[PDB]
Structure formats: C-alpha cells, structure tokens
Amino acid sequence: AVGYQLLLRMLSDYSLEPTPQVLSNAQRSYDALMTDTLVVPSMRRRGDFPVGQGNKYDVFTSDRYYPGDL
C-alpha cells in the first residue's frame, strides 16, 4: 500500500501517466489498509436516561441514571 501510494505521488516527476491496472492495485491495497484500522465507536447512552427498576438501582447499584461520560 505504501509503495503504491508513493509511486502515485512520484509519477508526475518523470512526466508519466499511470495505467488502470496500477490504479486498481493501489485501490485494493488502500482498501485493505483501511479495513485493518476500523473503529466503529459504538456510541453510549445519553446521561439522563433512567435505569429500570429491575436493575435494583439501590441494593446492587449506586447509580439511578446512566453516566454516559468519559
């Protein structure tokens, strides 16, 4: 991936034009690189959202509301 990107950024120095196969290979390598570094942050609760009475928010828990921070 790094080599293909560097070749794409250096081709203009020698006054050349990339072939479609080179572009496809670079695209596939970059897609693999992006796949390897996904996040999907999985957003949390709100912060004033109530916690149901079935959770036993006094005997077993000290929080009556979701913290939703830090």
**Binding residues for other proteins (CB under 8 A):** 58-62
Smallest gap from Cβ 66 to other proteins, in A, equals: 13
Smallest gap from Cβ 27 to other proteins, in A, equals: 43
Give the number of other Cβ atoms within 10 Å of residue 66's Cβ: 14
Residues 66 and 46: beta-carbon distance below 8 Å: yes
Smallest gap from Cβ 36 to other proteins, in A, equals: 30
Sequence-ordered alpha helix ranges (H) in 1-70 = 2-10, 20-35
Query: Whose Cβ is closer to other proteins: residue 14's or residue 60's?
Result: 60
